[PDB]
């Protein structure tokens, strides 16, 4: 459904397996390897709708494990994810090479 799937990872910055939209994100240049992750399971039925579900929490754990493990392989990347973005004075988004 023309969406992006995301994880924080949830243990890193508190963001679970979540749907987002492409026109509401800044693609940075910083790239971990998705190789070694099993995200094919997920779908609009997963994120369907009618307290937290065991499927949701356990699947978050399973993705977080491998993803955090790959994230250790880069210095200060965990702390980068833990931090939040904010525009400071003089920051001009049309000249920030994200």
């Amino acid at each position: 459904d023309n969406t992006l799937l995301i994880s924080g990872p949830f243990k890193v910055n508190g963001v679970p397996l979540r749907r987002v939209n492409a026109r509401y994100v800044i693609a940075t240049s910083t790239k971990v390897s998705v190789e070694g992750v099993n995200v094919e399971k997920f779908n609009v039925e997963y994120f369907a709708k009618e307290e937290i579900k065991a499927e949701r929490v356990e699947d978050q754990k399973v993705v977080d494990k491998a993803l955090i493990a790959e994230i250790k392989k880069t210095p200060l990347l965990k702390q980068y994810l833990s931090a939040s973005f904010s525009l400071k004075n003089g920051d001009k988004p049309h000249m920030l090479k994200f």
């Binding site: 026109r23 509401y24 994100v25 800044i26 693609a27 939040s84 973005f85 904010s86 525009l87 400071k88 003089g90 001009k92 988004p93 049309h94 000249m95 994200f98």
Partner: protein
């Protein structure tokens, strides 16, 4: 942190106008950090919000918003045109608007 800002801060200038006529349906915006049309092209299509306050509590909030979106550049100096859903009431000449970074494309 100290900051929580994901919006560029701009100013509402006059409406689109001649010397002696105005079009309320198009407002002119000055985006901070923007002094060229080639830079304003980044901000085309971006959402604008004028946030204001009122005494009457309407749905949990005393704060109200007018949404708009950038449409084209205006002039040579980075000034920009915007068109809001319900136009800006002209009391806001010199007031501050919030140019957001969505719809994003980098």
């Amino acid at each position: 942190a100290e900051s929580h800002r994901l919006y560029v801060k701009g100013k509402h200038l006059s409406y689109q106008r001649s010397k002696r006529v105005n079009n309320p349906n198009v407002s002119l915006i000055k985006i901070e950090g923007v002094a060229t049309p080639q830079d304003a092209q980044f901000y085309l299509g971006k959402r604008i919000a004028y946030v204001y306050r009122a005494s009457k509590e309407v749905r949990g909030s005393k704060i109200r918003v007018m949404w708009g979106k950038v449409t084209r550049t205006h002039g040579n100096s980075g000034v920009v045109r915007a068109t809001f859903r319900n136009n800006l009431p002209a009391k806001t000449f010199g007031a501050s608007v919030r140019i957001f970074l969505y719809p994003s494309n980098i």
